[PDB]
Design a protein around this ligand. Structure first.
Ligand SMILES: *[C@@H]1O[C@H](CO[C@@H]2O[C@@H](C)[C@@H](O)[C@@H](O)[C@@H]2O)[C@@H](O[C@@H]2O[C@H](CO)[C@@H](O[C@@H]3O[C@H](CO[C@H]4O[C@H](CO)[C@@H](O)[C@H](O)[C@@H]4O)[C@@H](O)[C@H](O[C@H]4O[C@H](CO)[C@@H](O)[C@H](O)[C@@H]4O)[C@@H]3O)[C@H](O)[C@H]2NC(C)=O)[C@H](O)[C@H]1NC(C)=O
Ligand SMILES: *[C@@H]1O[C@H](CO)[C@@H](O)[C@H](O)[C@H]1NC(C)=O
Lengths: 106, 130, 394
């Protein structure tokens, strides 16, 4: 699963984080998961099922699904969003794989 | 809704270490539990998963053979057995609860391919150096 | 002298002197052979070995199920399938499970489930076919060379080791200082290996009926696949359980070790001492002392006095053993020996260790002889200083 190295964006600005990794099956991308992890601290589920967002996670956080790509949108950047973002999906029917990791710089 | 972790410390290469992850605040017996690795200053790596009883288990190709997952619903705890630990296996191990699967499988038993998951609750982790 | 101290000790002597003599050897038995103007010999069967066994089958008596994998599909989604199904080290079974909204399916109905588990054998037994002619027998021929350490010495190489097969029975054995003894044996096994399988189980063995061995309901490997992974009939010890159409579970059936031993009551057992097989049967052998000769005999008697260097001990058969050292001159020498009555009138009792000689003065000689019942006098050496020793024998 290949994620861009790092994505930088000004506060107020809307950005997007891609996620694409070889797998040729709709079963994979439709089940992409996104995690917000600050340094040292434990990860947090921000998006599940490619677009579904759990209660607590800010409205600004969006979930897109492409044919062979996955996208995480942060519509309106804030200073507090400066962290590490990791996508995740199915390697095989019973296996999970995390992405390269994107470093969000506000 | 807690996920406590223990077992970390000094470990020599090609050695045995058992990692225990305690649980409270949910129906543990009914939830799929996961193990996820993370290097000192690098990215997340999914390690293993377990269904309710431990009949369906999965492992990363990187650990396949040298690792082993297990759990007892009595103690409400999940375990990771790591034998023949190579130097490249050095990281902070995390135990996570697949809470999303519970909205779909209220039993947490059925080993389906590509079922909807989402590692809801995470533990604080535990560092191992090998 | 190796036989001295063994309970099942047979004293065998030839008829018309002793040119030839018939002896029966067995595990635990020991035979002392005597022939006139021929050295006394100790024969003992020490080993029996099935030398070219052919494994027929190998049975698993203790099974272990590991590396369990399960896959399930929703109703109207097809039969589930694992790559462990094609793998022969695994045991797989499909079933049907009730699926609904509450367990993760958009529609209610039966959903296919498949469980696979790796069959690993913990303990096994082997069924070897032995050709009767391929049973190797090891016999020790220890002469009655008065030798200081000879007496009951199991390890210290005093005797010649010879190997016999039912096929090759006739053997010439060279005993240093005595010549050659010829052995024409004939094994009396009691039970032949005709349509018999030698069923070996760790440290125990049995002789079982072939078809019975080939009919045991246990997982097995052929003789053609030893160190193999694909165990045939894993189902005889593995059982699958799904009684509520909720979950499929694999179960083992537990060690058949004990169960087997019970079926093997009406079977000829074979024991094992120090990891080798101890066949119950006898072994009749014919001896030839024709090329055997007493060491010395052309020697002169001992001019000097003798010294009893160890207290006279009586064997379980009434015979006595006497260790005497030479203090005189003449060695290589010939020991004067006699057992008489309390007035030296008649020479009573025989001599087991025939023609006792001294090689080196410094080396003691062990003399074994059967004293007569009642009161006797053991006479060692010649005048002066003749060793007179009174003996008691009720
Ligand atoms: C069963 O048989 C054993 C061996 O079988 C026989 O061995 C020889 C002796 C022949 O009879 C032959 O026909 C057989 O193959 C037997 O073991 C042997 O016994 C002797 C002792 O009786 C062992 O040791 C030797 O003796 C000296 C002791 O010296 C003092 O005593 C003697 C009188 O006994 C005096 O003459 C001296 O002046 C001394 O006061 C040992 O010290 C020495 O052994 C050590 O030294 C040698 C040489 O440096 C080393 O090679 C050894 O390893 C020792 O460290 C002598 O060698 C003799 O070793 C031993 N032979 C073998 C092959 O082991 C045993 O006694 C019999 N047992 C029974 C219960 O019947
Ligand atoms: C099966 O699991 C055991 C215990 O974890 C392990 O030792 C073994 O290597 C695994 N099987 C295979 C085929 O590697």
């Amino acid at each position: 699963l290949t994620q861009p190295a790092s994505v930088s964006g000004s506060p107020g600005q809307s950005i997007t984080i891609s996620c694409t990794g070889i797998s040729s099956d709709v079963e994979t991308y439709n089940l992409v998961s996104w995690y917000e992890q600050h340094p040292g601290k434990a990860p947090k589920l921000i998006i599940y099922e490619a677009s579904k967002r759990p209660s607590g996670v800010s409205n600004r956080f969006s979930g897109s699904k492409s044919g062979n790509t996955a996208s995480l949108a942060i519509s309106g950047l804030q200073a507090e969003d400066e962290a590490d973002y990791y996508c995740c999906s199915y390697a095989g029917g019973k296996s999970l794989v995390f992405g390269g990791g994107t470093r969000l710089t506000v | 809704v807690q996920l406590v972790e223990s077992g970390g410390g000094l470990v020599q290469p090609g050695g045995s270490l058992k990692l225990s992850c305690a649980a409270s605040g949910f129906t543990f017996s009914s939830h799929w539990m996961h193990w996820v690795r993370q290097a000192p200053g690098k990215g997340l790596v999914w390690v293993s998963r377990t269904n309710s009883d431990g009949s369906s288990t999965s492992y990363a190709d990187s650990v396949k053979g040298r690792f082993m997952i297990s759990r007892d619903n009595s103690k409400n705890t999940v375990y990771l057995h790591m034998n023949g630990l190579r130097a490249e296996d050095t990281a902070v191990y995390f135990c996570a609860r697949d809470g999303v699967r519970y909205y779909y499988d209220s039993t947490g038993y059925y080993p389906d391919n590509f079922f909807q998951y989402g590692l809801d609750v995470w533990g604080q982790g535990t560092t191992v150096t090998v | 002298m190796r036989c001295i101290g063994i309970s099942n000790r047979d004293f065998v002597e030839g008829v018309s002197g002793g040119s030839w003599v018939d002896i029966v050897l067995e595990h635990g038995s020991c035979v002392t052979t005597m022939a006139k103007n021929k050295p006394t010999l100790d024969f003992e069967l020490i080993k029996t070995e099935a030398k070219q066994p052919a494994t027929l089958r190998k049975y698993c008596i203790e099974a272990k199920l590991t590396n369990t994998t399960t896959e399930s599909r929703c109703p109207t989604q097809g039969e589930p399938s694992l790559n462990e199904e094609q793998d022969k080290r695994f045991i797989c079974k499909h079933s049907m499970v009730d699926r609904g909204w509450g367990n993760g399916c958009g529609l209610f109905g039966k959903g296919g489930i498949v469980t696979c588990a790796k069959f690993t054998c913990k303990k096994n037994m082997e069924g070897k076919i032995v050709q009767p002619e391929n049973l190797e027998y090891t016999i020790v021929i220890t002469p009655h060379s008065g030798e200081e350490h000879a007496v009951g010495n199991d390890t210290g190489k005093h005797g010649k080791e010879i190997k016999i097969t039912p096929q090759s029975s006739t053997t010439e054995a060279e005993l240093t200082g005595y010549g050659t003894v010829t052995m024409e044996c004939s094994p009396r096994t009691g039970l032949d290996f005709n349509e018999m399988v030698l069923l070996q189980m760790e440290d125990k063995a049995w002789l079982v009926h072939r078809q019975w061995f080939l009919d045991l309901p246990l997982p097995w490997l052929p003789g053609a696949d030893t160190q193999g992974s694909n165990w045939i009939q894993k189902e005889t010890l593995v059982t699958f359980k799904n009684p509520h159409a909720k979950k499929q579970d694999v179960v083992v059936l537990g060690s058949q070790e004990g169960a087997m031993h019970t079926a093997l009551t009406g079977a000829t057992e074979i024991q094992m001492s120090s990891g080798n097989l101890l066949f119950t049967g006898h072994l009749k052998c014919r001896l030839r002392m024709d090329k055997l000769q007493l060491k010395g005999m052309s020697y002169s008697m001992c001019t000097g006095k003798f010294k009893i260097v160890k207290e006279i001990a009586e064997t379980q058969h009434g015979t006595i053993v006497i260790r005497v050292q030479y203090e005189g001159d003449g060695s290589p020498c010939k020991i004067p020996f006699e057992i008489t009555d309390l007035e030296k009138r008649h020479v009573l009792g025989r001599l087991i260790t025939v023609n006792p000689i001294v090689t080196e003065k410094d080396s003691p000689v062990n003399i074994e002889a059967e004293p007569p019942f009642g009161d006797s006098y053991i006479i060692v050496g010649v005048e002066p200083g003749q060793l007179k020793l009174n003996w008691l024998r009720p």
